[PDB]
Design a protein around this ligand. Structure first.
Ligand SMILES: Cc1ncc(COP(=O)(O)O)c(C=O)c1O
Ligand SMILES: Cc1ncc(COP(=O)(O)O)c(C=O)c1O
Ligand SMILES: Cc1ncc(COP(=O)(O)O)c(C=O)c1O
Ligand SMILES: Cc1ncc(COP(=O)(O)O)c(C=O)c1O
Lengths: 399, 399, 399, 399
């Protein structure tokens, strides 16, 4: 281990902090997954998970995998090799999903934007209006691009598909959005939505949570992609049998998810969404007070789960990250690929409160001084805390 | 929860009991997987994992998946669709691997044996001697068939491949054997060996541990199967970069594996193998004293990780399992598919000692009476404990 | 630290096995004991603790101490130096309490019996009959002598006090009885009852739980023993203030006690008492099958929380304890003081089930063979199992 | 129980934050305290505890008690009723110790100062000069008064005792100093030093750690105070027997203390003292920037483990504590007794780092605005950060 004094400040956008009640719930020996207790628990998880996607008709699947594995399940259950997909390259994780799509032998129409911009829906509109024969089988879009702090407008994608009477499936990566930003599966007509357990759900890595619409389930009948581990049909077979698991799940993660959902419902999903909004706004006010720039190029794309901070050209963003780890016991997110060295990222998602964030922001001011950037000490902390003092609600449990 | 008094007796062959030191090691918040601590830890895990496979030249991969996902990785990295495989159907898990092989569009030559028998190597010999053009690309064989308690002789498979000068790859499922039975990857010339974390390693579910020979790595160059999540090449890319992880791992499971390996090395792999042998022998002596039958039909196939007990035709093995759970707080393994109702299974693998086993065996005697089978109370416990009293070693830490 | 394979079998009569939900509850950071949460939790603990003493009139105190500290609190709050007490020396822990009584300058009338016998009540009657001037201020009696497996009849003590119309206080050590044997504080007119957390409550050491009748509280007014840390009046002061704690408690033990009481009420106290009666009878049956002798000399004094086993002259009881630790990963109780080397102890209390005990008993058979006693293997297990197969109830949570 | 989002900010001066490796170490079932493992562990604890007291001659005792119980042990082992003691009343905890001294029938010479001042050493000198017949048997002095943030100079007390050639014993409460401020038991000639586990050691409540000089041990021979639970002689008896425990310890706290001492030695005691000096100075700088006043009246008495902050007349200090709990998920210390409503306390001790403190300080700024104090947001954070950016050392484990 590389011990440092006090509690480590985890401000990467995934993995995130795990609440103590959830750590306690996972503190347990293994159990027999074919015992009656594990199906009974699973049944309550499947029902409650629908609530965080805001679906009544969707079917969830709890894969023992990561977000990348959930991606793969969404594609191989609904599509066949050679099928045409439209996807939006706006940063590193949208890029990696497109890399996966190409490697699974789909025909990807790539719509590129500069990093810090959102998906180009004008190009989408143009592609849909020209696609009279309905060759585009799916739209694959990242809701929140974790590399750049850009949130896309999923409802506008649905507006366009309906406008053109176009039957393409809508597959949405909500890995860094679900349970932090608003997500409305049924209202937006999302056919496959996915998230990972180590993001806003505030768990260890290891669940890739997939939720499919009736339309996506219908599509599996014609899907000629190959799948076994990620095949929805095996799960559906075991759902009907009442045992739920075609192979072994993580007992610990199932009890942990139970506790995580209980905390989410106790705080209240809409209160969680408002909490992320306050923390994102607070962070963006601090970045402006420092004189630095948000990577996000227009206010319509702001992300309340991550802020990608751009640094002047003589400052190395990856040196900020290194100094945070070595001196301040603080984990910040690296700039990736195209924005390597030009940004660092402040994650603000999952189970984190305002004083935690303010401690991070104060550390960043010291790091900036350490690398020779002339910040006025306290100016960002003061901008965040002046805003937060107006809006922090009282904790209802304490009256 | 379905609470019962005292400690639950977990005697299914996976998941198994987790030692307390490993539970403690996993009792932790998330950490940044791109921090320097996680690569440094990973490097020591990859080195030590080679020791439990007994390989010096093999390359390990720590997938966040289950044993079924490790299966899929072994096939899709080394083979192409349409390739001819020989595999051995001797029970439920060998059957499920063949189901997977067929579903990934390989041409499977299935060699069937009755449940309770081992792989038919005479048929193998015949297929190899006829295969002058080397159309068989791989042999896929389960080392220990968890459904029936049958262990196959992997060295004999290698003897035959070399005898016929035959270049087929050797893929071995050691899910219920590695770190309990002897496994000699390099001496046996295994090209892909795999295990799961929830078996003898004594962890939660969630790691599918794959170890590949240089020959298997060479084969990825010609593999035209599709893979992304399970693609070895992405791991190898990140191994060379020194960060190791192409996507997020489970932080908790990495520290837990560190603690599990430390305990394995402290007890000593050969002492662990001898401990499983004592417990299996003890169990088989008890079954004979009860007047029941081992499913395993010949002594050459006995399994020191699981004993499948056959019950007379008027006794329902699944009623034994149910009664264990409802009255004795004891988890026993169900008969599966073909042996449903005709067997129940006593798992004896992972971190379990002799008094734990004897408590299970005494419970089974009471259950047998409960269902009207005329056991002589104490006869199986006495047969096991008479044998064990000769062979239990002193605990070295206590002198 | 001195690792052995598998789970350690803890069969000493204190500390006992901690249920896993209680381990989870205690898995937490410190909290501010002056914050509103700790008084609110404490109030519920005080109410529910009364139910395990079976009192409605009594006042409980949760001292951060051990059983010996609860002893000391019991004495110094109700008595003055020079006060005459009657106490019963029947074993090591009744002896230690008398040693403490003498060192606190009380005038102790010691009624002695051989180890393996109960309190001599005909001597008590004679003392009460002769004490016309009520110089006897208290009877101090151990309910269950953990060193010998002897349980005294507290109801019979009250009968004698009432028969002679004698006002003495009745102080009762129930450290190894309460929440395992029946205990009726009000029905028996017990004035001070005490237990410790690491016994049948199944917690860590660290709470000395004292419960006082209104008569005992009146006695504090005239008690001139010196006390501060153990003074009930400081607790009562803070009870009235609403904050409950005159100095810092263990946060972890308070939450642990909440969880332990919840498990007790879920199983049901009467069911817990029944479960201890099964375990005790099964152990005594095994001892009889082995041809060994119970230390306890009459049936009326049998203890359902501990069995002290007498060994023949060529056997050293300490060697049995040593062998259990070194070979079998089993903890058994030593013979103490007068019975050192002549006995060993099997503890059967707190959260333990029948298959755990049977594993212990099977292990003891092997140890007896090791040290040269001609036991018939299986004979004690068979006697215990025959009995238990008729009496173990179904687990109500599992239907 | 009263859940709030994110991690709770624990800034009371006891209980303090527990490091995660210590939480993990304590996450364990009970064990037999008479088994060979617990004496072997205890011996290492006794040796290493001496290093935190900076003694080679002293004998430590690990009582299962709180700080108040360590007080009581200190007094009753070295003094007799009627013995004259000199003690210094400067705050709530020095007052409680005097209250205990009087209730144990000692003749207490009370030297009083205003809250916010240190011990009046010129009065002590005058007392020592006048005590020709050495009737003063001991000086009892709190090293750090946790109620006011005042640290006394123990070296100056020893200087006066030696100047007047006076033999009195020197008993020192270091409950909120040891392992945070410097403490030199032998160099200062301290005869009894005591601390509690839930302070800078960063454990749960439940150990009262007492360390006695050879002179204090000689004093037990003539001490006629009554004691059993707290009697050092019973410990010394069991030290010589090799088993160390006269009654049952907390297993979890022993392993927890092992892990806590390991963390202390890894960071380095001198580095821990430096870290507390940084935290204290940063807090006092923030207080000065806010325009508030330190309760401590002279620089020589400043405390690096707690800062008591005085608020203006229109502000109720208790309202600040309440608001911190209800809105900000922050625990701060109440003003006690004489300074109730006039002060609040910021605890800065044990395992806490600079970004944790800065989060607290930023939160206090918001609370001051809430309750109507015209703070300049960022002003205290900026003062603390400017100072800390020059002094935080690099974490040696991370290079
Ligand atoms: C939006 C998004 N999708 C997918 C991924 C990949 O998820 P994982 O690392 O769990 O495979 C990430 C990275 O965490 C992400 O941020
Ligand atoms: C030999 C064998 N291989 C593979 C599997 C499948 O493993 P998992 O359930 O982790 O997917 C099992 C079942 O546990 C097994 O026993
Ligand atoms: C009946 C009885 N009373 C008192 C004690 C002393 O308890 P402790 O070891 O908690 O101080 C014991 C020992 O556990 C005991 O068995
Ligand atoms: C200096 C000092 N001494 C003694 C005590 C009493 O300690 P406890 O609450 O552990 O009994 C305290 C309070 O924590 C204290 O601060």
């Amino acid at each position: 281990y590389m011990y440092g004094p006090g509690r480590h400040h985890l401000f990467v956008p995934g993995p995130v902090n795990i609440p103590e009640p959830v750590i306690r719930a996972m503190n347990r020996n293994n159990e027999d997954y074919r015992s009656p207790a594990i199906p009974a628990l699973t049944k309550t998880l499947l029902e409650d998970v629908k609530k965080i996607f805001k679906t009544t008709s969707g079917t969830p699947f709890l894969f023992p995998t990561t977000g990348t594995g959930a991606w793969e399940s969404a594609l191989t259950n609904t599509l066949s090799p050679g099928d045409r997909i439209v996807s939006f390259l706006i940063g590193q994780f949208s890029l990696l999903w497109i890399d996966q799509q190409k490697r699974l032998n789909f025909n990807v129409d790539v719509v590129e934007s500069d990093w810090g911009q959102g998906a180009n829906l004008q190009v989408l509109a143009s592609k849909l209006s020209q696609d009279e024969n309905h060759t585009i089988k799916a739209i694959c879009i990242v809701h929140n691009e974790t590399a750049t702090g850009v949130t896309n407008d999923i409802s506008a994608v649905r507006t366009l598909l309906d406008h053109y009477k176009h039957p393409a499936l809508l597959l949405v990566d909500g890995v860094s959005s679900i349970c932090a930003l608003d997500f409305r599966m049924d209202e937006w007509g999302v056919d496959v939505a996915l998230t990972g357990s180590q993001k806003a759900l505030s768990l260890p890595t290891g669940l890739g949570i997939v939720c499919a619409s009736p339309k996506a389930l219908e599509a599996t009948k014609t899907s000629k992609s190959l799948k076994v581990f990620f095949d929805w049909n095996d799960y559906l077979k075991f759902y009907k049998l009442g045992t739920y698991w075609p192979y072994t799940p993580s007992i610990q993660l199932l009890y942990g998810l139970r506790a995580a959902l209980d905390l989410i419902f106790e705080e209240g999903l809409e209160n969680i969404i408002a909490r992320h909004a306050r923390l994102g706004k607070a962070t963006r006010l601090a970045v402006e007070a420092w004189g630095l720039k948000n990577c996000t190029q227009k206010e319509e794309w702001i992300s309340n789960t991550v802020t990608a901070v751009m640094v002047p050209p003589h400052i190395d963003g990856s040196e900020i990250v290194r100094r945070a780890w070595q001196r301040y016991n603080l984990s910040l997110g690296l700039g990736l690929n195209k924005v390597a060295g030009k940004v660092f990222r402040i994650g603000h998602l999952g189970n984190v409160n305002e004083l935690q964030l303010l401690g991070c922001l104060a550390g960043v001011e010291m790091i900036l001084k350490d690398v020779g950037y002339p910040v006025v000490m306290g100016s960002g902390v003061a901008a965040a805390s002046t805003y937060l003092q107006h809006h922090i609600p009282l904790i209802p449990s304490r009256i």
